[PDB]
Amino acid sequence: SGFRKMAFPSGKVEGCMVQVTCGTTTLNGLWLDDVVYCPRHVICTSEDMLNPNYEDLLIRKSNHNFLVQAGNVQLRVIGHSMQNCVLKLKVDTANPKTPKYKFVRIQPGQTFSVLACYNGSPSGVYQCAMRPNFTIKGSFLNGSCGSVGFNIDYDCVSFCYMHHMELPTGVHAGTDLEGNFYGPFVDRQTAQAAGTDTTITVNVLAWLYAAVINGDRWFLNRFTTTLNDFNLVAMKYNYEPLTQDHVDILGPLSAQTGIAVLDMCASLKELLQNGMNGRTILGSALLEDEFTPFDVVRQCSGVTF
Amino acid sequence: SGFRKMAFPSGKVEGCMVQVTCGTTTLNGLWLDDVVYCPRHVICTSEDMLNPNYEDLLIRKSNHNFLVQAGNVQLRVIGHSMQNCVLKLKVDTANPKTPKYKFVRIQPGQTFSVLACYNGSPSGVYQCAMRPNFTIKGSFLNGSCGSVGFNIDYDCVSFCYMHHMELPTGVHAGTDLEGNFYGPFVDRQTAQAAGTDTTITVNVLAWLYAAVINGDRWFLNRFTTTLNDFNLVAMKYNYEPLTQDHVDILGPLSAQTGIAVLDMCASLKELLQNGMNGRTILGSALLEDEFTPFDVVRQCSGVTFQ
Ligand SMILES: CN1CC[C@@H](C(=O)Nc2cncc3ccccc23)c2cc(Cl)ccc21
Ligand SMILES: CN1CC[C@@H](C(=O)Nc2cncc3ccccc23)c2cc(Cl)ccc21
Ligand SMILES: [Cl-]
Ligand SMILES: [Cl-]
Ligand SMILES: [Cl-]
């Protein structure tokens, strides 16, 4: 019993975190095989960030301008190249702690664990969701750039996020490990804002199934709904549309609890229109949307890595 | 910016998790140096659990009755002893992944990270607090026994909890790493129940200071309170009493934000009376009590967002 916001075990990623310094700027890098990946803005001074020409700034740097520290060991940079908004520093040593890994780009609503780092040292691990507006509500201070987000499927670490910046509302923006930003953001000190966000409907339904599995049923009702009627209600409360793919993905949880997906949708529709009436679900007075259907099955089944 | 329920990176503990089997029972063990620590109930059958005589059950076991698996490698058990509710299995190999560590017994309200494990393999990491009633609200299934709670301040892992059981309300009970239970619980299947739980007041105040540091002030008010008047109100909402030690502990956060501890107490009294009226504090519609004053200072910036 119990249901917690649970991150993947971070050990496989901790063994990849390094400190990258270029001039006065220090941030985190991800060391996989003989390459260290980090945000390309490590080469910028605060003035450069106003309007940077990254290729021009990079052409002025030599390998010795990048100091990479892995624990208390300096790695030798033997090459440097840029791929989108990520800088790739070739080093003379392959990381002996390199796990089985892949680079994956996730979709909004997908969750991942963030290993927050400062000066190449892991400080904490927390579970995030990629918001529908492509930001993450992370917890990051100055020096956290280069911290990564990941999932684990079996013994393979799928790296999906690298931290780049904080937007004025305190939310965060970053890229996949190929340097492509999530969302319409750019790596420059210019006016940028997170768009209006929406709730991840399939994730709320998954969390309602988790509540039922854990003995909370007060919100269940005798009603069902059509997918079209639910989606009209979802649009009204800034909830993401629920697709037939989402309904299919919720199939296992629906079969385990005996509550059809559209039956759970009728519970959610009532919760939106009426609220919780002083009640809580899994110790929350808000509908939680940062657990995917897979997260719920994994936690409630005890999957290990 | 931002404020998340954040666990310590679990790598240093993952490299210590092993599987311990005794007969038909399999659970997790913590391998540090040449010793594997695990709940002593690994020697019980389900039947033995009502009134087990652990001394009598253990004397009947030899070293070869304990199978310890670290990854795909069987460790050889060369000794066994019981310390309170923990079984200590001496093994012939020191764990090369043993981090700098210590054993610490924590007090209610303290927080820690839990690395939930099954069959010696880590499944997930989450943040917990030792409730005032000495239970923890974990996420644990059958086979999770032996999973540990810890803090990693500096490069030293302080192990503070080992999971032993789930109580009928779905909450969890365990011991420190010396095998002493937290709370009035026993490692028996006898009728046991968690006492009435209460909110960790000092932690709620710490979290209100985190909200102020992150720019949220809507809940502040022009009032202050005496410590005694605060406790008379707070106790009516099943909040733990706030002691002068708690007021002292909140001093740094009080100095950083410019809000005196008793002034923040008056804000808490008003929140208990009014609720949030559709508003949230740090993305929560309830008052959060699983962040200590130490956690807030570690997570938050040294500069308040005035
Ligand atoms: C102007 N500026 C600041 C430094 C860096 C930035 O956002 N860094 C930070 C990241 N995460 C949390 C922070 C919390 C407080 C301060 C900085 C934080 C950055 C990066 C880009 Cl791509 C563009 C601009 C910019
Ligand atoms: C009767 N019984 C059951 C097995 C074990 C126990 O509590 N195991 C479990 C632990 N954590 C979560 C669980 C979730 C579902 C099931 C078991 C769980 C245990 C241990 C002691 Cl010390 C006393 C009694 C007892
Ligand atoms: Cl609601
Ligand atoms: Cl599934
Ligand atoms: Cl303590």
UniProtKB/Swiss-Prot annotation, chain B:
Q: What effect is documented for mutating N142A?
A: Does not affect ability to cleave and inactivate human TRMT1
Regions annotated as coiled coil: none
Q: Where is the active site?
A: H41 (for 3cl-pro activity), C145 (nucleophile)
* Record text on subunit structure and interactions: 3CL-PRO exists as monomer and homodimer. Only the homodimer shows catalytic activity. Interacts with host FBXO22; this interaction promotes the proteasomal degradation of nsp5.
Query: Covered residues of the complete protein?
Result: 3264 to 3569 of 7096
Taxonomy of origin reads: Viruses, Riboviria, Orthornavirae, Pisuviricota, Pisoniviricetes
Q: Which reaction does it catalyse?
A: TSAVLQ-|-SGFRK-NH2 and SGVTFQ-|-GKFKK the two peptides corresponding to the two self-cleavage sites of the SARS 3C-like proteinase are the two most reactive peptide substrates. The enzyme exhibits a strong preference for substrates containing Gln at P1 position and Leu at P2 position
- Localization: Host cytoplasm; Host Golgi apparatus; Host nucleus
- Record annotation: effect of changing K90R: In strain: Beta/B.1.351
User: What protein name is recorded for this chain?
Assistant: 3C-like proteinase nsp5
Query: At what sequence positions does the UniProt record place the cross-link Glycyl lysine isopeptide (Lys-Gly) (interchain with G-Cter in ubiquitin)?
Result: K5, K90
This chain's function reads:
Cleaves the C-terminus of replicase polyprotein at 11 sites. Recognizes substrates containing the core sequence [ILMVF]-Q-|-[SGACN]. Cleaves and inactivates human TRMT1, preventing tRNA guanine(26)-dimethylation of tRNAs. May cleave human NLRP1 in lung epithelial cells, thereby activating the NLRP1 inflammasome pathway. May cleave human GSDMD, triggering alternative GSDME-mediated epithelial cell death upon activation of the NLRP1 inflammasome, which may enhance the release interleukins 1B, 6, 16 and 18. Also able to bind an ADP-ribose-1''-phosphate (ADRP).
Activity regulation statement: Inhibited by pyridone-containing alpha-ketoamides compounds 13a and 13b. In turn, alpha-ketoamide 13b (tert-butyl (1-((S)-1-(((S)-4-(benzylamino)-3,4-dioxo-1-((S)-2-oxopyrrolidin-3-yl)butan-2-yl)amino)-3-cyclopropyl-1-oxopropan-2-yl)-2-oxo-1,2-dihydropyridin-3-yl)carbamate) inhibits SARS-CoV-2 replication in human lung cells. Inhibited ex vivo by michael acceptor inhibitor N3. Inhibited ex vivo by compound 11a and 11b.
Q: What mutagenesis or variant effect is reported for C145A?
A: Complete loss of 3C-like proteinase nsp5 cleavage
Show which residues sit on the Cytoplasmic side of the membrane: 1-306
Q: Which residues form the Peptidase C30 domain?
A: 1-306
Q: Consequence of mutating P132H?
A: In strain: Omicron/BA.1, Omicron/BA.2, Omicron/BA.2.12.1, Omicron/BA.2.75, Omicron/BA.4, Omicron/BA.5, Omicron/BQ.1.1, Omicron/XBB.1.5, Omicron/EG.5.1
